[PDB]
Amino acid sequence: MGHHHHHHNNIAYNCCWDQCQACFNSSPDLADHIRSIHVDGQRGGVFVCLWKGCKVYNTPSTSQSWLQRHMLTHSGDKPFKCVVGGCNASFASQGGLARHVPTHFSQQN
Ligand SMILES: [Zn+2]
Ligand SMILES: [Zn+2]
Ligand SMILES: [Zn+2]
């Protein structure tokens, strides 16, 4: 019978992030775009969550480790990659990354 709705009923996980209508059916792919266009997008010294669903969104914070740990809840990545465009560091646990990131955030002061 014509069942083109399929039994594969997977939703496209669209991020509710300010003007990013992007949707991935895979969790890592979603997290990837979060880290790339969301987390890495806020690289102006203050990182803000625009994820509508947070009760603390639209609030810029200089805590790169916190921001990442907050988005961890949203998409669920595993390796935390360096936020610096041009820096490569990835750790499955944030403790190692949380030591690496502030070395770059020694910018000026
Ligand atoms: Zn998005
Ligand atoms: Zn959020
Ligand atoms: Zn780095």
Description:
- A zinc finger (C2H2-type) spans 13-38, 52-74, 80-104.
- It comes from Homo sapiens.
- Belongs to the AEBP2/jing C2H2-type zinc-finger family.
- A hairpin with an 8-residue loop joins strand 1 and strand 2 (23-24).
- This protein is 33% helix and 7% strand.
- The relative contact order is 0.14.
- With 109 residues, the chain is mainly α.
- The chain folds into three domains: 1-45, no CATH class; 46-79, 2-Layer Sandwich (Double Stranded RNA Binding Domain), CATH 3.30.160; 80-109, 2-Layer Sandwich (Double Stranded RNA Binding Domain), CATH 3.30.160.60.
- The protein has a two-stranded antiparallel ribbon with strand order 1-2. The chain has a two-stranded antiparallel sheet with strand order 3-4.
- It binds zinc ion (3 copies).
- One zinc ion binds at residues 15, 17, 20, 22, 33, 37-38.
**Helix percent band:** 25-40%
Strand order of the largest sheet: 1-2
SSE succession: EEHHEEH
Number of contiguous helices: 3
What is the number of E strands? 4
Radius of gyration: 16 Å
How much β-strand is present in the residues?
5-15%
Shape: elongated
Bound small-molecule species: zinc ion
Oligomer: monomer
Tally the structural domains.
Answer: 3
Question: Major β-sheet, in short?
Answer: 2 strands, antiparallel
Structural class estimated from helices and strands:
mainly alpha
Q: State the separation between the terminal residues, measured CA to CA.
A: 67 Å
